[PDB]
Protein backbone atom coordinates (compact mmCIF):
# COMPACT_ATOMS: atom_id res chain seq x y z
CA UNK A 1 0.00 0.00 0.00
CA UNK A 2 1.58 3.75 1.17
CA UNK A 3 3.83 4.34 4.10
CA UNK A 4 2.09 7.09 5.51
CA UNK A 5 4.72 7.75 8.80
CA UNK A 6 8.26 7.82 8.18
CA UNK A 7 9.20 8.03 11.88
CA UNK A 8 11.53 5.22 11.75
CA UNK A 9 14.02 7.07 10.18
CA UNK A 10 16.94 8.40 13.28
CA UNK A 11 20.37 9.75 12.78
CA UNK A 12 23.46 10.56 15.15
CA UNK A 13 26.43 12.80 15.48
CA UNK A 14 29.60 11.94 13.76
CA UNK A 15 31.29 10.53 16.94
CA UNK A 16 27.71 8.16 17.44
CA UNK A 17 27.64 9.43 20.90
CA UNK A 18 24.00 11.45 20.54
CA UNK A 19 21.13 9.75 18.92
CA UNK A 20 18.35 11.71 17.45
CA UNK A 21 15.00 10.40 17.28
CA UNK A 22 11.55 11.57 15.81
CA UNK A 23 9.85 10.87 18.44
CA UNK A 24 9.85 13.03 21.78
CA UNK A 25 12.18 14.08 23.88
CA UNK A 26 14.17 12.98 20.76
CA UNK A 27 16.95 12.76 23.29
CA UNK A 28 17.25 10.13 25.70
CA UNK A 29 19.25 12.56 27.90
CA UNK A 30 15.74 14.86 28.37
CA UNK A 31 14.63 11.70 30.25
CA UNK A 32 18.03 11.86 32.12
CA UNK A 33 17.25 15.21 33.19
CA UNK A 34 14.04 14.32 34.12
CA UNK A 35 15.30 11.62 36.79
CA UNK A 36 17.04 14.03 37.99
CA UNK A 37 13.89 16.16 38.27
CA UNK A 38 12.99 13.05 40.70
CA UNK A 39 15.94 12.99 42.43
CA UNK A 40 15.96 15.74 43.75
CA UNK A 41 12.66 15.48 44.60
CA UNK A 42 13.91 13.62 47.48
CA UNK A 43 16.80 15.64 48.68
CA UNK A 44 14.83 18.12 51.15
CA UNK A 45 17.80 20.99 50.96
CA UNK A 46 17.57 21.31 47.08
CA UNK A 47 15.11 23.61 45.85
CA UNK A 48 16.51 24.45 42.68
CA UNK A 49 13.48 22.48 40.93
CA UNK A 50 11.73 25.21 39.42
CA UNK A 51 15.83 26.65 37.91
CA UNK A 52 16.65 23.05 35.74
CA UNK A 53 12.90 22.43 34.72
CA UNK A 54 11.32 25.40 33.85
CA UNK A 55 14.71 27.78 32.89
CA UNK A 56 16.78 24.94 30.98
CA UNK A 57 15.33 21.78 30.76
CA UNK A 58 11.94 22.97 28.93
CA UNK A 59 13.48 24.73 26.97
CA UNK A 60 15.54 22.57 25.42
CA UNK A 61 12.75 20.06 24.89
CA UNK A 62 11.63 22.93 23.07
CA UNK A 63 14.57 23.67 20.91
CA UNK A 64 14.43 20.28 19.79
CA UNK A 65 11.04 20.14 18.78
CA UNK A 66 11.19 23.46 16.95
CA UNK A 67 14.25 22.08 15.48
CA UNK A 68 12.69 18.60 14.25
CA UNK A 69 9.74 20.64 12.89
CA UNK A 70 12.30 22.69 10.53
CA UNK A 71 12.99 19.11 8.63
CA UNK A 72 8.93 19.19 8.29
CA UNK A 73 9.17 20.01 4.64
CA UNK A 74 12.05 17.51 3.47
CA UNK A 75 10.58 14.97 5.75
CA UNK A 76 7.25 14.91 3.30
CA UNK A 77 9.17 15.24 0.44
CA UNK A 78 10.87 11.82 1.45
CA UNK A 79 7.78 9.95 1.74
CA UNK A 80 6.44 11.53 -1.43
CA UNK A 81 9.66 9.35 -3.34
CA UNK A 82 8.96 6.19 -0.75
CA UNK A 83 4.95 6.24 -1.55
CA UNK A 84 6.09 5.91 -5.48
CA UNK A 85 8.92 3.71 -5.00
CA UNK A 86 6.69 1.09 -2.71
CA UNK A 87 3.85 1.31 -5.20
CA UNK A 88 3.81 0.11 -9.26
CA UNK A 89 0.12 1.35 -9.68
CA UNK A 90 1.51 4.80 -8.50
CA UNK A 91 4.95 4.71 -9.94
CA UNK A 92 2.74 4.08 -13.23
CA UNK A 93 0.97 7.16 -13.36
CA UNK A 94 4.35 9.27 -13.37
CA UNK A 95 6.73 8.78 -16.42
CA UNK A 96 10.65 9.02 -14.96
CA UNK A 97 12.62 5.58 -14.52
CA UNK A 98 13.06 3.51 -11.60
CA UNK A 99 16.57 4.35 -11.53
CA UNK A 100 15.82 8.22 -12.02
CA UNK A 101 13.32 7.87 -9.12
CA UNK A 102 15.64 5.60 -6.77
CA UNK A 103 18.24 8.08 -6.97
CA UNK A 104 15.87 11.26 -5.89
CA UNK A 105 15.01 8.98 -2.90
CA UNK A 106 18.64 8.61 -1.84
CA UNK A 107 19.57 12.27 -2.08
CA UNK A 108 16.08 13.36 -0.37
CA UNK A 109 16.72 11.02 2.82
CA UNK A 110 20.27 11.94 3.33
CA UNK A 111 19.35 15.41 3.25
CA UNK A 112 16.40 14.99 5.37
CA UNK A 113 17.99 12.61 8.59
CA UNK A 114 21.43 15.35 7.89
CA UNK A 115 18.75 18.08 8.59
CA UNK A 116 17.78 16.43 11.88
CA UNK A 117 21.34 16.76 12.89
CA UNK A 118 22.02 20.01 11.68
CA UNK A 119 19.71 21.97 12.94
CA UNK A 120 20.23 20.06 16.29
CA UNK A 121 23.85 20.91 16.88
CA UNK A 122 23.37 23.66 19.01
CA UNK A 123 21.02 21.83 20.85
CA UNK A 124 23.64 18.92 21.32
CA UNK A 125 26.31 21.57 22.39
CA UNK A 126 22.98 21.88 25.37
CA UNK A 127 23.54 18.67 26.75
CA UNK A 128 26.81 18.95 27.97
CA UNK A 129 26.35 22.07 29.29
CA UNK A 130 23.17 20.61 31.64
CA UNK A 131 24.92 17.74 32.97
CA UNK A 132 27.49 19.57 34.63
CA UNK A 133 24.60 21.60 36.31
CA UNK A 134 23.14 18.86 37.65
CA UNK A 135 26.61 17.48 39.53
CA UNK A 136 26.72 20.90 40.71
CA UNK A 137 22.84 20.74 41.59
CA UNK A 138 24.14 17.33 43.49
CA UNK A 139 26.97 19.08 45.31
CA UNK A 140 24.58 21.70 47.41
CA UNK A 141 23.53 18.31 49.28
CA UNK A 142 23.99 19.12 52.64
CA UNK A 143 26.14 15.59 52.91
CA UNK A 144 29.75 14.51 52.35
CA UNK A 145 31.75 12.33 53.36
CA UNK A 146 29.01 9.88 54.35
CA UNK A 147 25.63 10.30 52.24
CA UNK A 148 23.12 7.88 52.76
CA UNK A 149 22.28 5.35 50.23
CA UNK A 150 18.37 5.15 50.60
CA UNK A 151 16.94 7.29 47.83
CA UNK A 152 19.21 5.79 45.47
CA UNK A 153 18.14 2.13 46.19
CA UNK A 154 14.71 3.37 46.71
CA UNK A 155 14.83 4.67 42.32
CA UNK A 156 16.31 1.68 41.48
CA UNK A 157 13.68 -0.41 43.30
CA UNK A 158 10.72 1.89 41.26
CA UNK A 159 12.72 1.23 38.42
CA UNK A 160 12.26 -2.59 38.58
CA UNK A 161 8.78 -2.27 38.26
CA UNK A 162 8.94 0.14 35.36
CA UNK A 163 10.31 -2.68 33.76
CA UNK A 164 8.14 -5.29 34.29
CA UNK A 165 5.44 -3.02 31.84
CA UNK A 166 7.61 -3.49 28.93
CA UNK A 167 6.99 -6.71 26.86
CA UNK A 168 10.74 -7.30 26.31
CA UNK A 169 10.15 -11.43 25.45
CA UNK A 170 7.02 -11.10 23.21
CA UNK A 171 9.38 -8.00 21.45
CA UNK A 172 12.04 -10.69 21.40
CA UNK A 173 10.03 -13.28 19.75
CA UNK A 174 8.27 -10.48 17.59
CA UNK A 175 11.83 -9.16 15.80
CA UNK A 176 12.96 -12.98 15.40
CA UNK A 177 9.92 -13.48 13.77
CA UNK A 178 9.69 -11.20 11.07
CA UNK A 179 13.43 -11.09 10.70
CA UNK A 180 13.34 -14.82 10.02
CA UNK A 181 10.50 -13.65 7.35
CA UNK A 182 12.29 -10.97 6.42
CA UNK A 183 15.27 -12.74 5.11
CA UNK A 184 13.69 -15.72 3.68
CA UNK A 185 11.40 -13.34 1.54
CA UNK A 186 14.87 -11.89 0.71
CA UNK A 187 16.76 -14.82 -0.48
CA UNK A 188 13.58 -15.74 -2.41
CA UNK A 189 13.35 -12.32 -4.71
CA UNK A 190 16.96 -13.44 -4.96
CA UNK A 191 16.23 -16.89 -7.26
CA UNK A 192 13.13 -15.77 -8.25
CA UNK A 193 14.11 -12.65 -10.37
CA UNK A 194 14.60 -11.66 -13.88
CA UNK A 195 14.71 -9.22 -16.44
CA UNK A 196 12.78 -9.96 -19.44
CA UNK A 197 9.33 -8.90 -18.10
CA UNK A 198 8.04 -5.80 -16.61
CA UNK A 199 10.10 -5.46 -13.43
CA UNK A 200 8.62 -3.07 -11.20
CA UNK A 201 7.04 -5.10 -8.78
CA UNK A 202 10.27 -6.42 -8.31
CA UNK A 203 11.67 -3.20 -8.21
CA UNK A 204 8.64 -1.89 -5.29
CA UNK A 205 8.96 -5.07 -3.39
CA UNK A 206 13.10 -4.60 -2.71
CA UNK A 207 12.92 -1.62 -1.79
CA UNK A 208 10.52 -2.36 0.46
CA UNK A 209 12.94 -5.22 1.97
CA UNK A 210 15.60 -2.91 2.03
CA UNK A 211 13.70 0.03 4.45
CA UNK A 212 12.49 -3.60 6.35
CA UNK A 213 16.32 -4.23 6.70
CA UNK A 214 17.26 -0.97 8.54
CA UNK A 215 13.75 -0.81 10.60
CA UNK A 216 15.23 -4.32 12.01
CA UNK A 217 18.38 -3.07 12.30
CA UNK A 218 16.95 -0.30 14.26
CA UNK A 219 14.80 -2.28 16.72
CA UNK A 220 17.54 -4.70 17.53
CA UNK A 221 19.55 -2.10 18.63
CA UNK A 222 17.00 -0.57 21.21
CA UNK A 223 15.97 -4.36 21.99
CA UNK A 224 19.69 -4.88 23.13
CA UNK A 225 20.18 -1.17 24.82
CA UNK A 226 16.57 -2.13 26.89
CA UNK A 227 17.77 -5.20 27.79
CA UNK A 228 21.29 -4.23 28.69
CA UNK A 229 19.98 -1.20 30.87
CA UNK A 230 17.71 -3.72 32.57
CA UNK A 231 20.15 -6.23 33.55
CA UNK A 232 22.90 -3.73 35.10
CA UNK A 233 19.99 -2.08 37.37
CA UNK A 234 18.72 -4.93 38.23
CA UNK A 235 22.28 -6.29 38.89
CA UNK A 236 22.67 -2.85 41.17
CA UNK A 237 19.43 -4.46 43.07
CA UNK A 238 21.66 -7.34 43.82
CA UNK A 239 24.58 -5.63 43.71
CA UNK A 240 26.49 -4.04 47.05
CA UNK A 241 24.25 -1.93 49.34
CA UNK A 242 26.14 0.89 51.39
CA UNK A 243 24.44 2.71 53.72
CA UNK A 244 26.24 5.81 53.19
CA UNK A 245 28.93 6.83 50.48
CA UNK A 246 30.54 9.63 49.58
CA UNK A 247 28.69 12.91 47.72
CA UNK A 248 31.40 12.04 44.64
CA UNK A 249 30.36 8.57 44.64
CA UNK A 250 26.65 8.99 45.11
CA UNK A 251 27.33 11.20 42.28
CA UNK A 252 28.09 8.99 39.60
CA UNK A 253 25.36 6.42 41.24
CA UNK A 254 22.77 8.86 40.37
CA UNK A 255 24.40 9.44 36.82
CA UNK A 256 24.55 5.57 36.45
CA UNK A 257 20.86 4.92 37.42
CA UNK A 258 20.10 7.56 35.61
CA UNK A 259 21.43 6.83 32.20
CA UNK A 260 20.27 3.49 32.33
CA UNK A 261 16.51 4.27 33.13
CA UNK A 262 17.14 7.08 30.66
CA UNK A 263 18.36 4.55 28.10
CA UNK A 264 15.21 2.20 28.93
CA UNK A 265 11.96 5.14 28.18
CA UNK A 266 14.02 5.94 24.88
CA UNK A 267 13.94 2.63 23.79
CA UNK A 268 10.36 1.58 24.82
CA UNK A 269 9.66 4.92 22.67
CA UNK A 270 11.09 3.69 19.73
CA UNK A 271 10.54 -0.13 20.07
CA UNK A 272 7.00 0.68 20.35
CA UNK A 273 7.45 2.88 17.07
CA UNK A 274 9.73 0.83 15.20
CA UNK A 275 7.40 -2.66 16.11
CA UNK A 276 4.19 -0.43 13.94
CA UNK A 277 6.66 0.58 11.63
CA UNK A 278 8.24 -3.00 10.85
CA UNK A 279 4.32 -4.24 10.57
CA UNK A 280 3.15 -1.77 8.32
CA UNK A 281 6.43 -2.55 6.17
CA UNK A 282 5.99 -6.72 6.09
CA UNK A 283 1.70 -5.88 5.11
CA UNK A 284 2.79 -4.53 2.13
CA UNK A 285 5.63 -6.48 0.90
CA UNK A 286 2.44 -9.21 0.99
CA UNK A 287 0.47 -7.40 -0.59
CA UNK A 288 3.16 -6.55 -3.28
CA UNK A 289 3.91 -10.22 -3.49
CA UNK A 290 0.17 -10.99 -4.05
CA UNK A 291 0.64 -8.45 -7.32
CA UNK A 292 3.45 -10.64 -8.11
CA UNK A 293 1.58 -14.08 -8.43
CA UNK A 294 -1.77 -12.49 -8.72
CA UNK A 295 -1.59 -13.18 -12.99
CA UNK A 296 -0.16 -16.49 -12.70
CA UNK A 297 -1.64 -17.52 -16.31
CA UNK A 298 0.50 -14.54 -17.73
CA UNK A 299 4.04 -14.17 -16.26
CA UNK A 300 5.48 -13.73 -12.91
CA UNK A 301 9.39 -12.15 -13.04
CA UNK B 1 38.49 1.71 -3.10
CA UNK B 2 36.39 -0.28 -0.72
CA UNK B 3 39.15 -1.71 1.60
CA UNK B 4 39.39 -4.01 4.80
CA UNK B 5 42.55 -4.10 6.35
CA UNK B 6 43.13 -6.77 9.47
CA UNK B 7 45.20 -6.17 12.03
CA UNK B 8 46.19 -7.80 15.32
CA UNK B 9 47.78 -11.29 14.85
CA UNK B 10 50.18 -12.76 16.48
CA UNK B 11 52.03 -14.94 18.60
CA UNK B 12 49.95 -16.21 21.97
CA UNK B 13 50.00 -18.93 24.54
CA UNK B 14 47.29 -21.24 25.52
CA UNK B 15 45.14 -19.90 27.99
CA UNK B 16 46.13 -16.10 26.75
CA UNK B 17 44.01 -13.50 25.04
CA UNK B 18 44.32 -11.49 21.67
CA UNK B 19 42.09 -8.72 19.81
CA UNK B 20 42.01 -8.48 16.36
CA UNK B 21 40.48 -5.19 14.35
CA UNK B 22 39.29 -4.79 10.73
CA UNK B 23 39.59 -1.44 9.10
CA UNK B 24 37.42 -0.39 7.02
CA UNK B 25 37.28 2.40 4.39
CA UNK B 26 36.05 3.51 1.39
CA UNK B 27 32.25 2.86 1.93
CA UNK B 28 29.18 3.47 4.59
CA UNK B 29 30.55 0.89 6.95
CA UNK B 30 27.45 1.11 9.20
CA UNK B 31 24.68 0.23 7.55
CA UNK B 32 26.55 -3.80 6.43
CA UNK B 33 26.71 -6.78 8.78
CA UNK B 34 30.71 -7.47 9.05
CA UNK B 35 31.87 -11.20 9.45
CA UNK B 36 35.03 -13.03 10.45
CA UNK B 37 35.79 -16.05 8.93
CA UNK B 38 39.33 -18.12 9.65
CA UNK B 39 41.80 -20.45 7.65
CA UNK B 40 43.86 -22.99 9.56
CA UNK B 41 46.80 -23.58 7.07
CA UNK B 42 45.99 -25.88 4.70
CA UNK B 43 42.31 -26.16 5.54
CA UNK B 44 39.29 -24.42 4.46
CA UNK B 45 37.30 -21.48 5.19
CA UNK B 46 35.06 -21.33 8.84
CA UNK B 47 32.46 -18.90 9.71
CA UNK B 48 33.29 -17.83 12.82
CA UNK B 49 30.88 -14.95 13.97
CA UNK B 50 28.60 -12.17 12.38
CA UNK B 51 27.65 -8.64 13.69
CA UNK B 52 24.54 -6.84 12.42
CA UNK B 53 25.67 -3.29 11.20
CA UNK B 54 24.32 -1.41 14.25
CA UNK B 55 25.30 -4.57 16.81
CA UNK B 56 21.90 -5.39 18.07
CA UNK B 57 22.57 -8.93 16.99
CA UNK B 58 25.57 -11.12 17.05
CA UNK B 59 25.95 -14.87 16.25
CA UNK B 60 28.83 -17.07 16.82
CA UNK B 61 30.15 -20.86 15.70
CA UNK B 62 30.16 -23.45 18.39
CA UNK B 63 33.94 -23.94 18.09
CA UNK B 64 34.10 -20.31 19.22
CA UNK B 65 31.19 -19.15 21.06
CA UNK B 66 31.49 -18.37 25.20
CA UNK B 67 35.10 -17.54 24.30
CA UNK B 68 35.55 -15.24 21.33
CA UNK B 69 33.12 -11.94 21.17
CA UNK B 70 32.60 -9.05 18.07
CA UNK B 71 31.95 -6.13 17.98
CA UNK B 72 32.08 -2.90 16.01
CA UNK B 73 32.59 0.99 16.08
CA UNK B 74 30.59 2.88 13.61
CA UNK B 75 32.25 5.92 14.20
CA UNK B 76 35.92 4.63 13.15
CA UNK B 77 34.94 2.38 10.76
CA UNK B 78 36.66 -1.17 12.71
CA UNK B 79 35.37 -3.96 13.28
CA UNK B 80 36.76 -6.27 16.26
CA UNK B 81 36.98 -9.47 17.50
CA UNK B 82 38.36 -10.24 21.16
CA UNK B 83 39.27 -13.95 21.91
CA UNK B 84 40.09 -15.10 24.87
CA UNK B 85 41.11 -18.69 25.82
CA UNK B 86 42.76 -19.21 22.78
CA UNK B 87 43.33 -22.64 22.69
CA UNK B 88 45.73 -24.27 20.15
CA UNK B 89 43.39 -25.04 17.30
CA UNK B 90 42.68 -21.43 16.87
CA UNK B 91 45.99 -21.16 14.79
CA UNK B 92 44.57 -19.89 11.56
CA UNK B 93 44.51 -16.82 8.91
CA UNK B 94 41.83 -14.62 10.15
CA UNK B 95 39.58 -12.82 7.45
CA UNK B 96 37.63 -9.82 7.74
CA UNK B 97 34.57 -9.68 5.18
CA UNK B 98 31.56 -7.76 4.70
CA UNK B 99 28.16 -8.18 3.26
CA UNK B 100 27.73 -7.85 -0.70
CA UNK B 101 24.64 -5.34 0.61
CA UNK B 102 23.00 -3.61 3.50
CA UNK B 103 20.96 -4.64 6.04
CA UNK B 104 21.45 -8.45 5.33
CA UNK B 105 22.73 -9.83 8.35
CA UNK B 106 25.37 -12.34 6.73
CA UNK B 107 22.70 -13.61 4.77
CA UNK B 108 24.16 -12.77 1.77
CA UNK B 109 27.70 -13.08 -0.62
CA UNK B 110 30.82 -11.91 0.52
CA UNK B 111 32.11 -9.48 -1.70
CA UNK B 112 35.49 -7.93 -0.59
CA UNK B 113 37.60 -9.38 1.63
CA UNK B 114 41.10 -8.60 3.85
CA UNK B 115 44.82 -10.42 3.21
CA UNK B 116 44.27 -11.55 6.88
CA UNK B 117 46.24 -11.84 10.14
CA UNK B 118 47.67 -14.91 11.39
CA UNK B 119 47.33 -15.53 15.12
CA UNK B 120 50.01 -18.39 16.53
CA UNK B 121 48.71 -20.11 19.93
CA UNK B 122 51.39 -21.82 21.45
CA UNK B 123 53.76 -22.41 24.28
CA UNK C 1 23.31 -27.69 7.62
CA UNK C 2 26.34 -29.29 5.89
CA UNK C 3 28.00 -28.54 2.48
CA UNK C 4 29.53 -31.27 0.53
CA UNK C 5 32.57 -30.75 -1.85
CA UNK C 6 34.64 -33.04 -3.32
CA UNK C 7 38.71 -32.53 -2.56
CA UNK C 8 40.20 -32.09 -5.77
CA UNK C 9 38.70 -31.91 -9.60
CA UNK C 10 41.24 -32.14 -12.59
CA UNK C 11 40.87 -30.51 -16.14
CA UNK C 12 42.40 -29.85 -19.31
CA UNK C 13 43.30 -26.62 -20.62
CA UNK C 14 40.32 -25.06 -22.71
CA UNK C 15 37.90 -27.96 -21.06
CA UNK C 16 34.95 -27.36 -18.96
CA UNK C 17 35.61 -27.74 -15.04
CA UNK C 18 32.82 -28.25 -13.15
CA UNK C 19 32.59 -27.98 -9.11
CA UNK C 20 30.03 -29.49 -7.25
CA UNK C 21 28.59 -28.23 -3.78
CA UNK C 22 25.64 -30.68 -2.29
CA UNK C 23 23.46 -30.16 0.11
CA UNK C 24 19.77 -31.72 1.31
CA UNK C 25 17.21 -29.48 -1.19
CA UNK C 26 19.80 -26.71 -1.50
CA UNK C 27 17.91 -25.28 -4.61
CA UNK C 28 15.58 -23.56 -2.24
CA UNK C 29 19.06 -21.25 -0.94
CA UNK C 30 21.01 -19.07 -2.73
CA UNK C 31 24.91 -20.56 -3.21
CA UNK C 32 27.76 -18.36 -3.50
CA UNK C 33 31.64 -19.06 -4.86
CA UNK C 34 34.52 -18.20 -4.32
CA UNK C 35 38.00 -18.48 -5.79
CA UNK C 36 41.07 -18.40 -3.08
CA UNK C 37 44.41 -18.85 -5.26
CA UNK C 38 47.79 -19.66 -3.02
CA UNK C 39 48.37 -17.03 -0.57
CA UNK C 40 45.60 -14.60 -1.50
CA UNK C 41 42.12 -13.67 0.18
CA UNK C 42 38.99 -15.45 -1.22
CA UNK C 43 37.47 -13.54 -4.37
CA UNK C 44 33.61 -13.61 -5.03
CA UNK C 45 33.25 -15.55 -8.47
CA UNK C 46 29.87 -16.31 -8.83
CA UNK C 47 26.33 -15.38 -6.34
CA UNK C 48 22.63 -16.10 -6.12
CA UNK C 49 23.37 -19.20 -7.69
CA UNK C 50 24.21 -17.60 -10.91
CA UNK C 51 24.91 -13.86 -10.06
CA UNK C 52 28.66 -13.03 -11.59
CA UNK C 53 30.19 -9.77 -10.38
CA UNK C 54 31.55 -7.31 -12.62
CA UNK C 55 35.17 -8.18 -13.33
CA UNK C 56 34.59 -11.67 -13.42
CA UNK C 57 35.12 -13.51 -16.46
CA UNK C 58 31.96 -14.76 -18.58
CA UNK C 59 33.77 -18.34 -18.17
CA UNK C 60 32.37 -18.61 -14.70
CA UNK C 61 28.99 -19.51 -14.51
CA UNK C 62 26.88 -20.81 -11.80
CA UNK C 63 23.69 -23.56 -11.53
CA UNK C 64 21.55 -24.27 -8.73
CA UNK C 65 18.49 -27.20 -8.72
CA UNK C 66 17.14 -29.72 -6.28
CA UNK C 67 20.51 -31.09 -3.93
CA UNK C 68 23.30 -30.05 -5.61
CA UNK C 69 24.56 -27.03 -6.90
CA UNK C 70 27.34 -26.75 -9.47
CA UNK C 71 30.03 -23.98 -10.64
CA UNK C 72 31.35 -24.78 -14.56
CA UNK C 73 34.53 -23.03 -15.75
CA UNK C 74 34.95 -22.99 -19.65
CA UNK C 75 37.82 -23.30 -21.51
CA UNK C 76 39.81 -23.57 -18.41
CA UNK C 77 43.24 -21.67 -18.43
CA UNK C 78 46.25 -22.13 -16.18
CA UNK C 79 45.51 -19.19 -14.33
CA UNK C 80 42.39 -20.88 -12.93
CA UNK C 81 44.09 -23.04 -10.55
CA UNK C 82 42.39 -22.41 -6.90
CA UNK C 83 40.54 -23.56 -4.62
CA UNK C 84 36.62 -23.37 -4.62
CA UNK C 85 34.62 -23.07 -1.89
CA UNK C 86 30.37 -22.27 -2.07
CA UNK C 87 28.82 -21.13 0.46
CA UNK C 88 24.96 -21.28 1.61
CA UNK C 89 22.55 -19.71 4.82
CA UNK C 90 21.94 -22.55 7.34
CA UNK C 91 18.16 -21.44 7.98
CA UNK C 92 18.36 -23.71 10.87
CA UNK C 93 20.72 -22.18 12.84
CA UNK C 94 20.56 -19.23 11.21
CA UNK C 95 24.41 -18.31 10.25
CA UNK C 96 26.61 -18.80 6.89
CA UNK C 97 28.53 -21.89 6.50
CA UNK C 98 30.82 -22.72 4.08
CA UNK C 99 31.89 -25.95 1.90
CA UNK C 100 34.84 -27.78 2.64
CA UNK C 101 36.45 -26.52 -0.62
CA UNK C 102 37.31 -27.95 -4.11
CA UNK C 103 41.45 -27.73 -5.71
CA UNK C 104 41.52 -27.66 -8.85
CA UNK C 105 44.20 -29.23 -10.67
CA UNK C 106 44.76 -28.02 -14.53
CA UNK C 107 46.68 -30.74 -16.05
CA UNK C 108 48.71 -30.83 -19.41
Known amino acids: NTTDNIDYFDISDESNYYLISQLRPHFSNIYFFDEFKRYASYHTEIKRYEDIHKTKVNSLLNEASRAIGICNRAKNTVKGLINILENPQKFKTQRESYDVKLRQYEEKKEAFRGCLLNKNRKNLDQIKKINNEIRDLLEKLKCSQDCQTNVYFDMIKIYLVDFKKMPYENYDTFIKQYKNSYLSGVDMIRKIEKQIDNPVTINAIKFTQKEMGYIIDRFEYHLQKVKHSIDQVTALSDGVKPKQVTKNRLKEYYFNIGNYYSIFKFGKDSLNMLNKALIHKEKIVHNLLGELFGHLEERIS | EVQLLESGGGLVRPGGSQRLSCAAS????????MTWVRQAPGKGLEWLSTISGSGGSTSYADSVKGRFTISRDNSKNILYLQMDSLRAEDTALYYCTKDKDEYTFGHNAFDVWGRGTMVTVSS | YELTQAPSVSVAPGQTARITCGGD??????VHWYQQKPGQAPVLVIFYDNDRPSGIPERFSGSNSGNMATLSISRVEVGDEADYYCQVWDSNNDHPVFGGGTKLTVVG
Open chain 3, 25 to 30: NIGRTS
Open chain 2, 26 to 33: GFTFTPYA
